[PDB]
Design a protein around this ligand. Structure first.
Ligand SMILES: Nc1nc2c(ncn2[C@@H]2O[C@H](CO)[C@@H](O)[C@H]2OP(=O)(O)O)c(=O)[nH]1
Ligand SMILES: [Ca+2]
Length: 104
């Protein structure tokens, strides 16, 4: 079974930890990757009820199982905070335009 399901993409907690660690390392070093400069601030325009405190940062999680290194980021992201605490997993899949919905 999937710990997180983003549309048709299935992720386990290990997938999430792995992606999160990569994104957090970049954030800590002050470096970015890709044209959209990941990781970057996630403003939470959606108003999600994350149980962990802001600020939040977005970082793509890929269905291929590889860590993001540039190029298309797909529709899924791992949201973490300043303390490397997972806030949640979100996706553009199933949401209109550039909005997000939570992965179930
Ligand atoms: N929908 C949404 N997009 C956000 C938020 N914070 C930052 N973004 C970024 O703001 C821009 C317009 O929605 C996009 O570049 C999106 O980036 P991503 O595609 O990387 O998520 C947020 O809270 N909600
Ligand atoms: Ca739906």
């Amino acid at each position: 079974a999937c710990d997180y399901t983003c549309g048709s993409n299935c992720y386990s907690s290990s997938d999430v930890s792995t992606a999160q660690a990569a994104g957090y390392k970049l954030h800590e070093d002050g470096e970015t990757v890709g044209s959209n400069s990941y990781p970057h601030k996630y403003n939470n325009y959606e108003g999600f009820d994350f149980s962990v405190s802001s600020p939040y940062y977005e970082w793509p999680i890929l269905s291929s199982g590889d860590v993001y290194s540039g190029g298309s980021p797909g529709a899924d992201r791992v949201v973490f905070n300043e303390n490397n605490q997972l806030a949640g997993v979100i996706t553009h899949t199933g949401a209109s335009g550039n909005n997000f919905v939570e992965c179930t």
